[PDB]
Design a protein around this ligand. Structure first.
Ligand code: AKG
Ligand code: MN
Length: 266
DNA sequence: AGAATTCCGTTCCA
DNA sequence: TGGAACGGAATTCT
């Protein structure tokens, strides 16, 4: 119900001035139409209403930032058993929001205190361009969430993918169904141009992501999976918000403690 | 103690 | 519907 050529011109205009980069060979498709099979460049997916359900902007992060974060991420993850980590709040399995167990650890500290305040700026950049509805929602959240995660997004996921790990949750095709808003994704580490791509299975679209790129898309609606890497290290951050952020209460404590607090108020 | 297993609890889907 | 799934443990075995 709208012109895609003009909408792309609008999005490109905002993104060019905001990120101060020229995005060549940018493309736009409606969600109903046939998506590009291979996206190495700027790409946008919209509905009939005009809202952006996917945005991919190549290399918006300064190389100095990607390299420093990578080195620290790899340093911390070495001393970690699990291949995933989380900062901010999680409502998973509980009818309340709770502080992640990792926030007290080295990973959670580095994300919240150092990484997130810097990344929060590029998130602000991204949202003011592609989605107004998202940032309008994120600023309505409890102040405690913003203070906790030091970011507009109340929750941050840390995905460490080493070569030939098929057991990682991002290696299995899925949807994140708790998400009330499209997530913002940042990538780090080093891996090849032909591997570690995010594939949307139902739309048959392969987005090839490299360190420094940003990806903004709905995780609940579109089933997606991360491809295997034969070399390098694939590290990425997922900034999201669940439904429980608005709906469920907050006791300002970790999971087990909050459960005790939750019951005693009932 | 340091392994394997069960548990609390929400949400979904083949 | 059983059971896996962006958690995070406590029990229960060797
Ligand atoms: O890292 C990616 O490219 C995707 C992450 C993802 O799908 C998830 O965290 O569920
Ligand atoms: Mn996902």
């Amino acid at each position: 119900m709208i012109n895609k050529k003009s909408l792309l011109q609008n999005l490109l205009s905002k993104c060019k001035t905001t990120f101060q980069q020229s995005f060549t060979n940018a493309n736009i498709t409606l969600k109903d139409e046939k998506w590009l099979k291979n996206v190495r460049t700027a790409y946008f997916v919209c509905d009939h209403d005009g809202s952006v359900e996917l945005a991919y902007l190549p290399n918006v992060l300064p190389k100095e930032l990607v390299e420093e974060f990578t080195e620290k991420f790899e340093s911390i993850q070495t001393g970690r058993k699990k291949d995933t980590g989380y900062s901010g709040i999680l409502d998973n399995s509980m009818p309340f929001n709770y502080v992640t167990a990792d926030l007290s650890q080295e990973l959670g500290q580095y994300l919240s205190e150092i990484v997130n305040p810097q990344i929060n700026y590029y998130i602000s950049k991204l949202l003011t361009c592609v989605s107004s509805r998202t940032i309008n929602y994120l600023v309505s959240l409890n102040d405690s969430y913003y203070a906790l995660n030091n970011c507009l997004y109340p929750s941050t996921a840390f995905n460490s993918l080493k070569p030939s790990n098929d057991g990682h949750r991002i290696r299995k095709p899925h949807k994140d169904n708790l998400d009330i808003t499209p997530s913002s994704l940042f990538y780090f580490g080093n891996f090849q141009n032909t591997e570690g791509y995010l594939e949307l299975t139902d739309k048959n679209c392969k987005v090839f992501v490299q360190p420094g790129d940003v990806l903004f898309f709905k995780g609940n609606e579109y089933k997606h999976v991360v491809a295997n890497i034969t070399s390098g290290w694939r590290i990425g951050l997922v900034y999201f918000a669940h439904k429980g952020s608005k709906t469920k209460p907050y006791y300002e404590d970790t999971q087990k403690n909050s459960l005790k607090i939750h019951k005693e108020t009932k």
